[PDB]
């Protein structure tokens, strides 16, 4: 069955790109189309030359699309989804997306490649789009973590705090980046997610500077 599963994302990827060519500069029409399939589709995330090229969901909670594809049907690999706490249009300091990593080379399997400096060099930019504009993700950190509390923070009490976070985030990186991030920039965190109650406790985190290129 994994056949049709791949086919579904294949149809949808081909559809997105045609819309991205049909409506081009305009992202509003592109996503009003995607939302016909499912209103929870709030964005699209793509990394050229890799399997990362999917729609981003957001439900009421962070287990809503843990085991559900984009048309709301049960799947072990579920789908890529944003933290239920993040706002669109007016991004929080830190926006977070999650996705499975099973080794099938799908969803967030590519986050592991970011641990290697070589790979990072050849894939410094990641594309992210939604109804409010086109964005560019400038990867500036990648690492493994056993925790699951601090790196999932949405906003901060003050610049100092956010400042510390950025510093910490930079120090944890296993890759070197030329990207210069400041407490004035907004960031996006791509996090790996295990199955419900899998509790394998071992995640791959990739962090990037968000840039509106529209």
Summarize the structure.
The chain is of the alpha+beta class and 214 residues long. It is built from 4 helices and 8 strands, in the order H-H-E-E-E-E-H-E-E-H-E-E.
Into which percentage range does the β-strand content fall? 25-35%
Number of domains: 1
List the secondary-structure elements in sequence, H or E.
HHEEEEHEEHEE
* CATH top level label: Mainly Beta
Number of strands: 8
Distance between the termini: 39 Å
CATH topology description:
Sortase, Chain: A
Range of helix content: 10-25%
Describe the strand arrangement of the main beta sheet, using strand numbers: 1-2-3-4-7-8-6-5
Inertia-based shape? globular
Characterize the largest beta sheet: strand count, sense, and whether it forms a barrel.
Answer: 8 strands, mixed, barrel
At the fourth level of CATH, the homologous superfamily is Sortase
* Structural class label: alpha+beta
Output the number of helix runs: 4
Q: If classified by CATH, what would the architecture be? A: Beta Barrel
Query: Radius of gyration, Cα only, in angstroms?
Result: 16 Å
């Amino acid at each position: 069955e994994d056949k049709q599963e791949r086919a579904n994302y294949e149809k949808l990827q081909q559809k997105f790109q045609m819309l991205m060519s049909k409506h081009q500069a305009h992202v509003r029409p592109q996503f009003e189309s995607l939302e016909k399939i499912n209103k929870d589709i709030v964005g699209w995330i793509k990394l050229s030359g890799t399997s990362l090229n999917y729609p981003v969901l957001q439900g009421k909670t962070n287990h809503d699309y843990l085991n559900l594809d984009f048309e709301r049907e049960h799947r072990r690999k579920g789908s890529i989804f944003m933290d239920f706490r993040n706002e669109l249009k007016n991004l929080n300091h830190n926006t977070i997306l999650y996705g499975h990593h099973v080794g099938d080379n799908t969803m967030f399997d590519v986050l592991e490649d970011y641990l290697k400096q070589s790979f990072y060099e050849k894939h410094k930019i990641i594309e992210f789009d939604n109804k409010y504009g086109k964005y560019q993700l400038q990867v500036f950190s990648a690492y493994k973590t056993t925790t699951k509390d601090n790196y999932i923070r949405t906003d901060f009490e003050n610049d100092q705090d956010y400042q510390q976070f950025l510093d910490e985030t930079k120090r944890k990186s296993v890759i070197n980046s030329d990207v210069n991030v400041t407490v004035k920039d907004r960031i996006m965190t791509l996090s790996t997610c295990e199955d419900a109650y899998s509790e394998t406790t071992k995640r791959i985190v990739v962090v990037a500077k968000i840039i509106k290129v529209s």
